[PDB]
Symmetry: C3
Subunit: 211 residues, 3 copies
Amino acid sequence: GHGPDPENILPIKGNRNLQFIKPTITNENILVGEYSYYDSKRGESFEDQVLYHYEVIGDKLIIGRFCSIGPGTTFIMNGANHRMDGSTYPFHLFRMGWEKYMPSLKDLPLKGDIEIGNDVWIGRDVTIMPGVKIGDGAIIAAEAVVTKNVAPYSIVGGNPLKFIRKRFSDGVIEEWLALQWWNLDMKIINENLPFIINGDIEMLKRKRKLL
Amino acid sequence: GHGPDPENILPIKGNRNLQFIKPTITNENILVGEYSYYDSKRGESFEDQVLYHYEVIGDKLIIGRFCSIGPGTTFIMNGANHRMDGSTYPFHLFRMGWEKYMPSLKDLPLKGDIEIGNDVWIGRDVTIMPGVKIGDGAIIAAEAVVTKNVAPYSIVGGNPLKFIRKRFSDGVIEEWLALQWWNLDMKIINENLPFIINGDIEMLKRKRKLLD
Amino acid sequence: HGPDPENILPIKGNRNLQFIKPTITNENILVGEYSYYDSKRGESFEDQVLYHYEVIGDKLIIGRFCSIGPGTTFIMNGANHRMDGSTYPFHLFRMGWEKYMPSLKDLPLKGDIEIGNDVWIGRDVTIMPGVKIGDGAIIAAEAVVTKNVAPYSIVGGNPLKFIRKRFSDGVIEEWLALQWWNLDMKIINENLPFIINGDIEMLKRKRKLLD
Ligand SMILES: [Cl-]
Ligand SMILES: [Cl-]
Ligand SMILES: [Cl-]
Ligand SMILES: [Cl-]
Ligand SMILES: [Cl-]
Ligand SMILES: [Cl-]
Ligand SMILES: [Cl-]
Ligand SMILES: [Cl-]
Ligand SMILES: [Cl-]
Ligand SMILES: [Cl-]
Ligand SMILES: [Cl-]
Ligand SMILES: [Mg+2]
């Protein structure tokens, strides 16, 4: 059985910062696929990086498989959102007669769930805004503030986020998105690792005898 | 008078991070209005977020009332601004003969006070540069670097700062600025609170027309 | 006359501002005299050098009399992954994947980070791999240096933007021809009132009688 145990929190026995995210999950509304890792700074858990995530709001954080999440990467959820109709001041938090002004969930600018695809490389100290969707194979530069959606297999970075370039031609991206090697069994992946790594997409298609 | 005590440092039960700024001010030249709060990370003091702030400079940091100041927000004052006529190296700091090369403040590029208005929402990890004016009701996006003045009731963000959009119409902004609910008595603030929150500016305008 | 460049803590009472050169213990880090690091809480400069691995052999070079603000980070080439297909570092987890380690040809290595002399680097700046920064250049705070920085130019932001040139083209050439940082400390101490007040025309007179 080539490969590490995806349920083993600390796969690299010399390393104590790099953690497989999935088996560390405790909270709800957080779904992280197998083999996705978080390379922490001082050993902090991935969930500590998830901020403003209140069960009451119901927003979710979805991360696909085989994702590289750099140290300091922050996920800002909808809890950070202030009401923008009149004053942005959350009077209700202080109570003492102001709890009657408790906002409804429909009074708040809810941006939705954060969805991160598979095989995603997220640079160091990246901050991710609420409602952001990130496509498979996407690359996010370090120190980037992801203020919008990121296309599959695209390189982006900066504050606010800027589109740098697309990794492969539009046709090639289609083939990767049609293949979805991350959803295959580990037996198949291990037998296809060379072509996945060197990006020989036209060999993977021969490897998978389709109809 | 309903509402929390503005003198109360930690006004929320079971919260050790969100603080009322004004009653924490120990240092000078930091003028912060009532109800303006700082939601700290590890419970750190607001003043610790104020950098390069030396008293003799008379450099002032002004913040209005009812401001939301996110965690990690730092305020860069003039202070340690190196000379830019030649070498930016601060020789005088190391002394041992170099102390005579202390820059005259006439030779220093002072930008002036940091002035932040009322009802301002500043996101997490924002950096604010010297001499920056921020108008009432503005919104600073998270991780932003304020390198320029921010117009009242506008949304800004980025590094360097970019203008995103205006919060409301020009006419509606004028109505808020003519209102100045933060400058009204707490009695009548509570009396207008349901409208201040849902943004019923038309009602607020009517209430103030009545108050003449 | 002046401070001792071999003194780790040049200022009495200051436990944060360090001379970088006498603190260096690791390899491939070359820092000139009088260049200092004004740390947040006393941390060593080397700790601000990230993804610096011996197996790559990339170097960090910094001239003399550089001001480096707190939180400044230097990102080296050990960060980037293979980008031909999957950016997932399989080889790290081993257990049958160690064979999939990428060669140097497979990696998008950007080279060495070279910073000149008399360079002012603001607080919380991040330096990307392969970046060259000219002499006298000023790096604004919070900036992410994603490209080369011309000598005596002011830059900042993420990604890096060009703000302005400090002096005219002629004056810049004159500073670059002067190189006061290469003069003997006896000569520098005689010219400090001119190095600081920027009066370079008087320096050209003085260098003429020196040459
Ligand atoms: Cl919760
Ligand atoms: Cl959604
Ligand atoms: Cl764009
Ligand atoms: Cl190959
Ligand atoms: Cl300037
Ligand atoms: Cl703009
Ligand atoms: Cl009153
Ligand atoms: Cl190493
Ligand atoms: Cl091996
Ligand atoms: Cl010498
Ligand atoms: Cl002078
Ligand atoms: Mg930018």
